[PDB]
């Protein structure tokens, strides 16, 4: 009886297991653009993404996993609120059952079809498992997605989804170019936050990107045929695979732009 999505093991279940699910700085959380700080502290976000190796895709029984050679600073973030480097490891997104939904972030209140989430971690820790011990461990990247045009850079993610479609499954995912899954502006609104699944850990710098991505229905239909279960055990599409937002608590976020 482990922690998921569903009615009986979803969201507001887990505090059960992981009570620092009702902590001071869990995400996501929903963005007031109204009353985000435009901070002149912020610098630009860089991202630098052009020796990035891409390795394999998982689909974890939670989402799916695009991973990274993350052995070496091939695939980093740096600068915006940050103040070291941070190695790209993975992304994943999470998404809805229906296009009003899925989202994690919301823009005042606004739910998005699918959000991207690139998971960086500090390299002064030395790996992934120390750094989310610590309050600056991680930097996430959350780039909203909205079904209107098809998101070329995306297609071929898409197409390998049958190859991975129950828990466990993986395939080998090489020279994946993640630049193509970035919109046009890097503008962002950035507060500090949580891994939004299980263990909820507090080491979460979030870089939430003002401009979404546009893909086509028919991308986020091949997200919605992925399955939950193993192989051999009964269908349970992964949709939803969203925390709803969190309570604020003491937090004020802060925009790059204004
Ligand atoms: N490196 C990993 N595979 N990460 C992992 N253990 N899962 C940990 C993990 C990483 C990122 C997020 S999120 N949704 O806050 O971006 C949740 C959980
Ligand atoms: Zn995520």
Same mark, same amino acid.
């Given at each position: ?9 979803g ?5 059960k ?7 001071? +700085? ?6 007031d653009?109204?009353?985000?700080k435009y901070?002149?502290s912020?610098?630009?976000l ?5 020796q990035?190796?891409?390795? +394999?895709?998982?689909?974890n029984?939670?989402a ?9 600073d091939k ?5 915006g ?12 997104f ?11 972030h919301?823009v ?7 959000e991207?989430?690139l998971?960086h ?14 309050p600056?461990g991680?930097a ?8 209107g ?7 071929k993610?898409?197409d390998?989804?049958?190859?991975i479609?129950?828990?466990?499954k993986?395939?080998?995912?090489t020279?994946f170019?993640? +630049?193509?899954?970035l ?13 939004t699944?299980?263990?909820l ?16 229905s ?12 193993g ?11 969203? +925390?709803?937002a969190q ?8 925009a790059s732009?204004?």
């Amino acid at each position: 009886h482990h922690w998921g999505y569903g009615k009986h093991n979803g969201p507001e279940h887990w505090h059960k297991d992981f009570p620092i699910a009702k902590g001071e +700085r869990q995400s996501p959380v929903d963005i007031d653009t109204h009353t985000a700080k435009y901070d002149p502290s912020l610098k630009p976000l860089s991202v630098s993404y052009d020796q990035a190796t891409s390795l +394999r895709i998982l689909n974890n029984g939670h989402a799916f996993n695009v991973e990274f050679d993350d052995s070496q600073d091939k695939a980093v973030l740096k600068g915006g609120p940050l103040d070291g480097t941070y190695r790209l490891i993975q992304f994943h997104f999470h998404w809805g059952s229906l296009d009003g939904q899925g989202s994690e972030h919301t823009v005042d209140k606004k739910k998005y079809a699918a959000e991207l989430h690139l998971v960086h971690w500090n390299t002064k820790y030395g790996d992934f498992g120390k750094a989310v011990q610590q309050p600056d461990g991680l930097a996430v990247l959350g780039i909203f997605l909205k079904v209107g045009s098809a998101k070329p850079g995306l297609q071929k993610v898409v197409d390998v989804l049958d190859s991975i479609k129950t828990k466990g499954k993986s395939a080998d995912f090489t020279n994946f170019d993640p +630049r193509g899954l970035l919109p046009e502006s890097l503008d962002y609104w950035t507060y500090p936050g949580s891994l939004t699944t299980p263990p909820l850990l507090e080491c979460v710098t979030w870089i939430v990107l003002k401009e979404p991505i546009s893909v086509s229905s028919e991308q986020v239909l091949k997200f919605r045929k992925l399955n939950f279960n193993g192989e051999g055990e009964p269908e349970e599409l992964m949709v939803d695979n969203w +925390r709803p937002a969190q309570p604020l608590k003491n937090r004020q976020i802060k925009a790059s732009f204004k």
